[PDB]
Design a protein around this ligand. Structure first.
Ligand SMILES: CCCCCCCCCCCCCCCCCC(=O)OC[C@H](CO[C@@H]1O[C@H](CO[C@H]2O[C@H](CO)[C@H](O)[C@H](O)[C@H]2O)[C@H](O)[C@H](O)[C@H]1O)OC(=O)CCCCCCCCCCCCCCCCC
Ligand SMILES: CCCCCCCCCCCCCCCCCC(=O)OC[C@H](CO[C@@H]1O[C@H](CO[C@H]2O[C@H](CO)[C@H](O)[C@H](O)[C@H]2O)[C@H](O)[C@H](O)[C@H]1O)OC(=O)CCCCCCCCCCCCCCCCC
Ligand code: CLA
Ligand code: CLA
Ligand code: CLA
Ligand code: CLA
Ligand code: CLA
Ligand code: CLA
Ligand SMILES: CC1=C(/C=C/C(C)=C/C=C/C(C)=C/C=C/C=C(C)/C=C/C=C(C)/C=C/C2=C(C)CCCC2(C)C)C(C)(C)CCC1
Ligand SMILES: CCCCCCCCCCCCO[C@@H]1O[C@H](CO)[C@@H](O[C@H]2O[C@H](CO)[C@@H](O)[C@H](O)[C@H]2O)[C@H](O)[C@H]1O
Ligand SMILES: CCCCCCCS[C@@H]1O[C@H](CO)[C@@H](O)[C@H](O)[C@H]1O
Ligand code: OEX
Ligand SMILES: [Cl-]
Ligand SMILES: [Cl-]
Ligand SMILES: [Cl-]
Ligand SMILES: [Fe+2]
Lengths: 137, 81, 451, 342, 334, 38
């Protein structure tokens, strides 16, 4: 099995547009995700709130939709609760709160796209492991 | 002592190293090439990183019959297109 | 080559340094060169850390142990321990590294070029281990030196910028200490505190006024003691109590160092004042408590009444009582109720955690901090995979508190072993049977049978 | 009577750097192949077709995780000979089917036979009593019980230990979860023999070293001994008084002391072997019936025994699907045993 | 001689059937106290709430235990590292419920055994012996400290100290494996090399000495009668033993120096056990065994399991089951 | 409980004092050979 361009092709937006990540982008996405997100999100779960995971289905059912590049980049800029009702930048890492989450300070737009690409591609590889927790280890 | 030349004699002699400065690197290089040419994989039947699964398969190729086991492995191998 | 084989010295190569026991010049050499090695490591390791250092990740995510030591002293950091200038780290590193050259130069000189014995060269630098007065004198010089060191800590804290204070009002920050605790009831009160839970002996020191005052006391005590030992010679009772030989003095010092190592292990494990969690990561207790806090916050946002929530065992799911009635976090963290930290204390009233403050006054920064600490708990593998033992690879993290604690337990233990070894040997040698039993004078042979 | 047999006998027993012997004809090829098989397998050979595991340096394993793994369960107890009906003379397929496992197990067994024969042969030539071979009977009982009889009692070689560090660790944990092996009095006697043996080793070494006669001038005391000397190098009388006063009893007879040093770890290993023969048949010390009757009727009754059983249940359910792939276990999440939160 | 002087002479006397000594002066009351409390508790103690969740565990014989299942149960998690002597309880019934006997016993014991080590030094000195037998004893002693004191300190509770019983010991081991992956820790591995090696070398030395005993008896009597207590000559022929062993392996793999040999017999298990103790004492601060969970990954990124991952599944079973009622939040952080 | 506590404190103190004053009573000289170690 291989990491093909097809595997690396993921939704850019909600209107049926896709983008194809380079292998370098995939690697960058894994590195940046480990750097800024894995402390809470290792394996696709969420340690400080296990009710919400990073599975593609979960993200699709988020408001606004979070199962595409745009949705995820926006989330990393201005994160909301699952229903979109509250802005949670004060307690979740984002560009908007890079003052209080200093690791977001050097994340560039390119970086955010890479992280998003990681979050979308990983379950295409790992399946239920992603967001699965220890049951699937 | 039991008659053979003491090791400390041998490995401090010029001749030993004239021989072994060739024989030792030669063996090391041979072992390297055994892996680097990919021969090892084929000799022992070890999957390369792209040969554990077909592209969409996620089930282990477990051998389940004793006497047709060879053919099963051949079939698993064929299934990697 | 005086004394450099087993036949002349009595010691095999693997005990070769024992050939130095009565060779003061060369022994001076060994000591100075070793000091050189220590200072060398301090410099080099600091420069390594600084080179690998990313200013906007927490220090504890980066495998740093010396930069935290520097930042604790108030150098390079600002509010909440954020790095504002890496230059002092650079200075500390370079200066130690350069000094190590001077030390090594001296050490090598005395070790292989200088006078092998110092006694003929100088009565002042020469010594006989069995000369008690000279021993107490050198001891005294060194006590004065240590006193001065403690006083340098004091001077930093009071006149040269202050120290990093995790407890500063408004949030952790660098702060000048203006009123050090001088009251002996406080200072020595720490010394008489139980080492068990909720007490914690000197490890419980939780404010810099006490730290600084304590160092004033230790500075004066060491200088005074130094002077005392320069001016006196051991009294009769001491003379009859101790063994007086190089190996004996070494063994005594090994006992002292072992004790100090165990102490430092506990300090770095429990204390979050002189080892600020901003730099070292949260303590184990801290992170456990922080988990509790994190889920209380989440569930209460969902609408849970956390004060009245009965857990499966009958104890409070979030909140319960300590054995003396104080309101504490529930679950397994019931064990860690003696934990105290600046992010938690605003929720604490006279009877412990306060339900009104919990319901009404938890700030987003407290939630952030509790999340951070809960997810940087000091658990991880030898190959630095962060988390519980069953966690998958992904996070490269082992807490500095763990590195420091484990390293110093291993060292302290081996140092106790060394104390037993050298103390036992010193006794046997002083009595004259360290090389074995005299066949013609076996003591047991002149003793009455046991039965 | 100087025929070819006696000439060969002459050659085999030459006092050379590495003694050969008649036993060497069995020992050397068998030991060499066993070690070579292990090194060869752990370096190059997979366990993908037998276990669904990577198991070699080639695949990315390290020294702790490499192994030569047992054959698939479907092989049963096949000798799995290279020219056998399974591999049919095909070396690559043989490696993929786990033939190196039986190669190593079998050559290793004959090699151990060879080594003990070597202990006999050398003892006989030199003129000493053969207690070293006798003591070696314990490694033999262990290897035979664990690597042969145990899986012969089970479904297949699959459940034998696989030859590797982590693989062995897995064997330990499996035995805990499925067999409750720590509860077994035969294992317990084994533990007593091993730790008691280590204790004797340490205490005897230290005692000798600390009741030495001063037989030289040096502070390093090793040189003050001569192999040919008639005299004891340490005082048994002083040793005896010290231990009598410290611990209440002491050795007084050196011959008994040394025999006891044989007896303790050898007997311990033998007892462990017996318990493993029982486990070959799942004839376990798993439960105390009285405990279970009381506990089943009384939901407040709790001991460390019941607690350990809950741990075992966890082990079985959580490890089985991946550890026993031929069973095709699918345990839905909801059936997995778990305490609160975890 | 005055009274204090005579007392000192008796205490340090080399003529007592059991040596007392100054270390013995502390050792004797402490060991008696721990022993007496342990015996009474083992037989008759009521159940103890080890995990502080009002879920008392029965350890004593009279309360439904046998020798194998019985224990003196660790003190309550509600107590943590707090000092809980009898006089801190409102009543003995309370003291018992909360696991007070455990603290009494382990503290008196650790002190007493520390004094046992000291005493080995002390008698070595009175008898004109070399002093290092005590150093050997430091290896099992450090191990007891690790499991009774250091591990609790690191984890924040005596409730996580090793139980004083057989099955309780096994419980401690299984939980330790779930929480630290001790098997994959090199210090535990050195420990195993130390005890396996010790048993091996014990058997080896036993068998070689026994093999080379000099003929001094007939066939109808024990060979043991060929040695007499305090005889001056060695009772076996070491040159013959070495002649055997050096040929079993090769010449330079066998010891011909008895002192060197016995030193090795002391050092190997002692060092190995020192590391065993340090494994427990460092895992106490959660620096754990090697973790290779999902270390091997294919070209697409599928996880390729190794034996380390199977170990991981077993560890998960242990983890999710242990103390089934004591966790309310998703991470077990001590 | 208080009587128990005082009692135990007194006992502990007694034995600790024996240990200390005991090891101070010319211990290096209590050996079979060379006694003068002052
Ligand atoms: C001459 C001989 C002298 C000795 C003779 C015998 C003397 C008595 C025996 C001592 C035994 C003590 C046992 C308890 C050790 C312990 O629980 O130690 C822990 C304490 C620290 O206690 C903790 O201290 C903490 C203080 O932090 C508090 O304050 C902090 C301030 O920042 C933080 O805010 C923190 O959150 C807050 O909790 C809390 O009070 C905790 O509740 C409390 O448990 O360490 C300490 O007191 C200091 C460290 C003690 C050293 C450890 C000894 C190890 C010995 C190993 C032996 C090996 C032997 C090998 C054999 C061969
Ligand atoms: C002392 C130390 C001395 C020094 C050590 C020297 C080492 C020498 C090396 C010896 C190697 C032995 C190989 C044994 C192979 C074996 O057994 O192979 C097993 C076979 C039997 O085959 C098994 O048979 C099973 C049952 O099948 C039967 O039942 C089925 C279910 O209904 C079907 O009907 C099936 O068709 C029918 O055949 C399954 O099919 C298994 O898959 C299959 O492996 O027996 C056989 O070859 C022979 C069986 C009889 C002889 C066994 C004696 C030797 C072993 C003794 C160990 C005791 C074991 C008891 C446990 C306690
Ligand atoms: C911190 C480690 C340390 C230090 C400082 C020393 C120091 C010493 N050892 Mg010891 N030793 C050590 C570890 C150490 N040892 C270890 C680990 C072992 C076991 C292998 C020994 C075994 C041993 C034996 C058997 C003996 C000593 C002896 C000595 C002394 C004389 C050395 C000599 O004559 O060599 C001569 C060596 C040379 C001429 C070669 C070069 C030596 C120099 C120092 C190297 C300097 C390199 C350095 C990078 C230069 C930087 C210069 C720059 C600053 C300008 C000296 C004081 C001897 C002694 O006691 O004699 C009285 C002795 O017999 N040692
Ligand atoms: C107080 C001692 C101490 C402590 C707590 C640390 C801690 C750390 N070091 Mg530092 N370091 C030290 C001394 C120490 N070091 C020394 C002496 C050197 C010179 C070699 C270094 C050079 C160094 C480098 C180059 C790096 C670190 C790094 C680190 C971090 C990761 C460590 C790691 O992964 O270890 C892995 C664990 C081991 C290697 C295990 C060692 C086991 C030893 C050998 C057992 C010894 C037992 C005992 C002493 C022997 C007694 C024998 C008996 C018979 C008597 C960690 C914060 C890394 C980092 O993150 O930097 C930012 C890094 O790259 N250190
Ligand atoms: C504690 C370490 C120490 C000690 C006790 C000694 C002692 C000695 N040295 Mg050595 N030496 C040392 C370290 C030491 N040295 C170092 C680090 C170096 C490299 C610079 C040398 C290089 C050296 C050489 C080349 C020579 C000596 C010589 C001597 C002898 C003559 C001393 C004298 O007359 O000074 C008189 C007193 C003074 C000159 C005043 C010194 C002022 C000091 C340096 C100011 C700093 C003091 C302060 C407390 C230092 C803190 C340092 C700390 C931060 C690390 C004397 C035995 C001589 C010798 O052996 O001849 C046979 C000799 O030729 N030393
Ligand atoms: C009683 C002595 C003592 C104690 C308890 C402390 C404690 C502390 N120091 Mg201070 N310090 C001391 C002496 C001491 N120091 C001396 C002599 C110096 C000059 C070297 C310093 C210079 C210094 C600096 C520059 C810094 C500290 C810092 C600290 C804090 C963190 C470091 C740590 O964990 O050390 C643990 C302490 C020990 C392990 C020592 C315990 C000693 C025991 C109680 C006594 C042993 C006595 C001996 C065996 C008996 C003598 C024999 C006699 C009976 C015959 C901690 C509160 C740091 C700090 O405050 O950050 C803000 C810091 O930056 N210290
Ligand atoms: C490294 C530092 C150091 C060292 C190695 C020494 C060494 C010595 N001192 Mg000195 N001293 C020092 C620092 C030091 N001193 C300082 C800083 C001062 C100022 C306070 C003094 C003031 C001083 C005086 C007034 C005297 C000494 C004396 C002595 C000699 C006998 C001490 C003795 O018997 O201790 C062993 C300790 C005892 C016998 C005490 C009784 C045993 C109790 C029960 C120990 C319990 C301690 C406990 C375990 C500690 C744990 C922590 C605790 C605080 C809770 C010995 C040469 C004596 C001497 O001979 O003078 C000429 C003496 O009269 N010293
Ligand atoms: C000399 C010591 C020795 C011993 C005891 C063994 C033993 C074994 N080997 Mg090993 N092996 C050895 C050396 C040894 N080997 C050497 C030097 C090599 C390198 C060539 C090998 C390479 C090797 C491989 C590749 C394999 C084995 C295997 C085996 C096992 C099956 C053997 C078998 O069935 O033989 C059957 C043959 C005999 C028992 C010969 C008996 C002699 C008779 C009595 C004489 C009469 C013969 C007759 C006249 C001839 C008629 C033939 C005609 C009808 C065609 C067995 C445990 C197999 C294995 O381990 O599977 C897992 C396997 O695959 N061996
Ligand atoms: C005696 C003896 C010994 C020992 C020795 C020793 C221990 C020595 C030491 C020595 C030493 C201790 C040395 C040191 C040195 C140092 C140096 C030489 C340094 C230099 C530095 C520099 C040059 C710097 C640089 C820089 C800068 C300035 C900036 C930044 C960057 C850099 C880093 C580049 C032995 C064991 C062998 C044995 C015999 C005897
Ligand atoms: C906290 C515990 C108390 C700590 C107090 C420490 C203070 C330091 C000084 C203590 C007093 C030392 O007092 C010490 O004990 C007794 C008292 O008669 C003396 O007397 C002893 O002398 C000889 C010495 O060969 C002994 O054989 C003899 O048995 C004994 O009478 C010691 O020679 C003296 O040195
Ligand atoms: C097995 C050994 C069988 C030996 S066989 C034996 O061998 C002799 C020479 O060795 C011959 O001289 C003799 O005739 C023959 O019977
Ligand atoms: O206590 Mn006994 O075991 Ca050490 O982790 Mn946490 O707590 Mn409980 O859980 Mn897992
Ligand atoms: Cl879900
Ligand atoms: Cl449990
Ligand atoms: Cl919990
Ligand atoms: Fe012996």
């Amino acid at each position: 099995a291989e990491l093909t361009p097809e595997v690396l092709t993921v939704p850019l937006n909600s209107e049926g547009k896709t983008i194809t990540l380079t292998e370098k982008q995939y690697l960058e996405g894994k590195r940046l995700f480990q750097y800024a997100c894995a402390s809470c999100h290792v394996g696709g779960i969420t340690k400080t709130n296990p009710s919400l995971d990073l599975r593609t289905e979960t993200l699709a059912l988020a408001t606004p939709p979070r199962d595409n590049i745009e949705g995820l980049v926006d989330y990393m800029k201005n994160p909301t609760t699952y229903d979109g009702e509250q802005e949670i930048a004060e307690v979740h890492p984002s560009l908007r709160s890079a003052d209080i989450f200093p690791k977001m300070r050097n994340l560039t737009e390119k970086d955010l796209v890479a992280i998003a690409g990681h979050i979308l591609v990983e379950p295409k590889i790992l399946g239920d492991k992603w967001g699965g927790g220890k049951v699937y280890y | 002592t039991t008659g053979e030349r003491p090791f400390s004699d041998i490995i401090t002699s010029v001749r030993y190293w004239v021989i072994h400065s060739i024989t030792i690197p030669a063996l090391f290089i041979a072992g390297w090439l055994f892996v680097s040419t990919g021969l090892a994989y084929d000799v022992f039947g070890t999957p390369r990183p792209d040969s554990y699964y077909a592209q969409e398969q996620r089930s282990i190729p477990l051998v389940t019959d004793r006497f047709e086991a060879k053919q099963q492995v051949e079939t698993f191998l064929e299934q990697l297109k | 080559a005086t004394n450099r084989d087993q036949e002349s010295s009595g010691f095999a190569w693997w005990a070769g340094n024992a050939r130095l026991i009565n060779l003061s010049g060369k022994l001076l050499g060994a000591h100075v060169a070793h000091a050189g090695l220590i200072v060398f490591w301090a410099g080099a390791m600091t420069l390594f850390e600084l080179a690998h250092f990313i200013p906007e990740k927490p220090m504890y995510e980066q495998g740093l142990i010396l930069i935290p030591h520097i930042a604790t002293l108030g150098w390079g950091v600002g509010p909440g321990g954020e790095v504002v200038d890496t230059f002092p780290f650079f200075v500390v590193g370079v200066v130690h590294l350069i000094s190590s050259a001077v030390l090594g130069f001296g050490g090598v000189y005395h070790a292989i070029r200088g006078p092998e014995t110092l006694e003929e060269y100088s009565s002042f630098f020469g010594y006989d281990w069995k000369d008690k007065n000279k021993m107490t004198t050198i001891l005294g010089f060194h006590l004065i030196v240590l006193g001065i060191g403690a006083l340098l800590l004091v001077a930093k804290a009071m006149f040269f910028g202050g120290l990093y204070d995790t407890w500063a009002p408004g949030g952790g920050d660098v702060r000048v200490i203006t009123n050090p605790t001088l009251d002996p009831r406080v200072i020595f009160g720490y010394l008489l505190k139980s080492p068990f839970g909720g007490e914690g002996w000197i490890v419980s020191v939780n404010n810099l006024e006490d730290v600084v005052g304590g160092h004033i006391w230790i500075g004066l005590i060491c200088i005074a003691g130094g002077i005392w030992h320069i001016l006196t010679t051991p009294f009769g009772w001491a003379r009859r109590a101790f063994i007086w030989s190089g190996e004996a003095y070494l063994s005594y010092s090994l006992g002292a160092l072992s004790m100090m190592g165990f102490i430092a292990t506990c300090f770095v494990w429990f204390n979050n004042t002189v080892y600020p969690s901003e730099f070292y990561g949260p303590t184990g207790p801290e992170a456990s408590q922080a988990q509790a806090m994190t889920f209380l916050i989440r569930d209460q946002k969902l609408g849970a009444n956390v004060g009245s929530a009965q857990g499966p065992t009958g104890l409070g799911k979030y909140l319960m009582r300590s054995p003396t009635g104080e309101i504490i976090f529930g679950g397994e963290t019931m064990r860690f109720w003696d934990f105290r930290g600046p992010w938690l204390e605003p929720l604490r009233g006279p009877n412990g955690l306060d339900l009104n403050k919990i319901k009404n006054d938890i700030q987003p920064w407290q939630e952030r901090r509790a999340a951070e600490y809960m997810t940087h708990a000091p658990l991880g593998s030898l190959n630095s995979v962060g988390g519980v033992a069953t966690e998958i690879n992904s996070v490269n993290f082992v807490s500095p508190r763990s590195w420091l604690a484990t390293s110093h337990f291993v060292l302290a233990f081996f140092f106790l072993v060394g104390h037993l070894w050298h103390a036992g040997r010193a006794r046997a040698a002083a009595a004259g049977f360290e090389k074995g039993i005299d066949r013609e004078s076996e003591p047991v042979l002149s003793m009455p049978s046991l039965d | 009577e100087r025929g070819w047999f006696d000439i060969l006998d002459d050659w085999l027993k030459r006092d050379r750097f590495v003694f050969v012997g008649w036993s060497g004809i069995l020992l050397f090829p068998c030991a060499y192949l066993a070690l070579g098989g292990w090194l060869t397998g752990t370096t190059f050979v997979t366990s993908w077709y037998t276990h669904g595991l990577a198991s070699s340096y080639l695949e990315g394993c390290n020294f702790l995780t490499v192994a030569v793994s047992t054959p698939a369960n479907s092989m049963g107890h096949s000798l799995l000979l290279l020219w056998g009906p399974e591999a049919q003379g095909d070396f690559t397929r043989w490696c993929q089917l786990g033939g190196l496992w039986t190669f190593i197990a079998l050559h290793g067994a004959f090699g151990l036979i060879g080594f003990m024969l070597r202990q006999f042969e050398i003892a006989r030539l030199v003129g000493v009593r053969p207690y070293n071979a006798i003591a070696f009977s314990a490694p033999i009982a262990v290897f035979v019980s664990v690597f042969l009889i145990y899986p012969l009692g089970q479904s297949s070689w699959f459940f034998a230990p696989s030859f590797g560090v982590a693989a062995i660790f897995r064997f330990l944990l499996f035995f805990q979860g499925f067999h409750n092996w720590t509860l077994n009095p035969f294992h317990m006697m084994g533990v007593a023999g091993v730790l008691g043996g280590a204790l004797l080793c340490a205490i005897h070494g230290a005692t000798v070293e600390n009741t030495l006669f001063q037989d030289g001038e040096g502070a390093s005391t090793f040189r003050a001994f001569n192999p040919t000397q008639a005299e004891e190098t340490y005082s048994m009388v002083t040793a005896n008084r010290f231990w009598s006063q410290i611990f209440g009893i002491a050795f007084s007879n050196k011959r008994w002391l040394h025999f006891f040093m044989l007896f303790v770890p050898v007997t311990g290993l033998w007892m462990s072997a017996i318990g493993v023969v029982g486990l070959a048949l799942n004839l376990r010390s798993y439960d105390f019936i009285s405990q279970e009757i009381r506990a089943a009727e009384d939901p407040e009754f709790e001991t460390f025994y019941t607690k350990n059983l809950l741990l075992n249940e966890g082990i079985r359910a959580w490890m089985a699907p991946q550890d026993q792939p031929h069973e095709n276990f699918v345990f839905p999440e909801e059936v997995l045993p778990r305490g609160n939160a975890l | 001689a005055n009274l204090w002087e005579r007392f000192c002479n008796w205490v340090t006397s080399t003529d007592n059937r059991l040596y007392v000594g100054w270390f013995g002066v502390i050792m004797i009351p402490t060991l008696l106290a721990a022993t007496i409390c342990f015996v009474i508790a083992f037989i008759a103690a009521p159940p103890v709430d080890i995990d502080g969740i009002r879920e008392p565990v029965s350890g004593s014989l009279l309360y439904g235990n046998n020798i194998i299942t019985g224990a003196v149960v660790p003190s309550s998690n509600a107590i943590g590292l707090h000092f809980y002597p009898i006089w801190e309880a409102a009543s003995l019934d309370e003291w018992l419920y909360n696991g007070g006997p455990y603290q009494l016993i382990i503290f008196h014991f650790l002190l007493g055994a520390s004094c046992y080590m000291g005493r080995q030094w002390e008698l070595s000195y009175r008898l004109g012996m070399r002093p290092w037998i005590c150093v050997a004893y430091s290896a099992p002693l450090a191990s007891a400290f690790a499991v009774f004191l250091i591990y609790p300190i690191g984890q924040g509770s005596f409730s996580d100290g090793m139980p004083l019983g057989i099955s309780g010991t096994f419980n401690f081991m299984i939980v330790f494996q779930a929480e630290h992956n001790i098997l994959m820790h090199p210090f535990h591995q050195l420990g195993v090399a130390g005890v396996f090696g010790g048993a091996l070398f014990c058997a080896m030395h036993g068998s070689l000495v026994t093999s080379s005993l000099i003929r001094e008896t007939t066939e109808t009597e024990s060979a043991n009668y060929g040695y007499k207590f305090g005889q001056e000559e060695e009772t076996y022929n070491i040159v013959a033993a070495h002649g055997y062993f050096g040929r079993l392996i090769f010449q330079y793999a066998s010891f011909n120096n008895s002192r060197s040999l016995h030193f090795f017999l002391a050092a190997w298990p002692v060092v190995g056990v020192w590391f065993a103790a340090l494994g427990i004492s460092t895992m106490a601060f959660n620096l754990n065994g090697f973790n290779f969970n999902h270390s091997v990954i294919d070209a697409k990124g599928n996880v390729i399991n190794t034996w380390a991952d199977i170990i991981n599944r077993a560890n998960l079973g242990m983890e999710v089951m242990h103390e089934r009622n004591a966790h309310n939040f998703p991470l077990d952080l001590a | 409980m208080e009587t128990l506590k005082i009692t135990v404190y007194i006992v502990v103190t007694f034995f600790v004092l024996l240990f200390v004053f005991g090891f101070l009573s010319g211990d290096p000289a209590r050996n079979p050979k060379r006694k003068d170690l002052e």
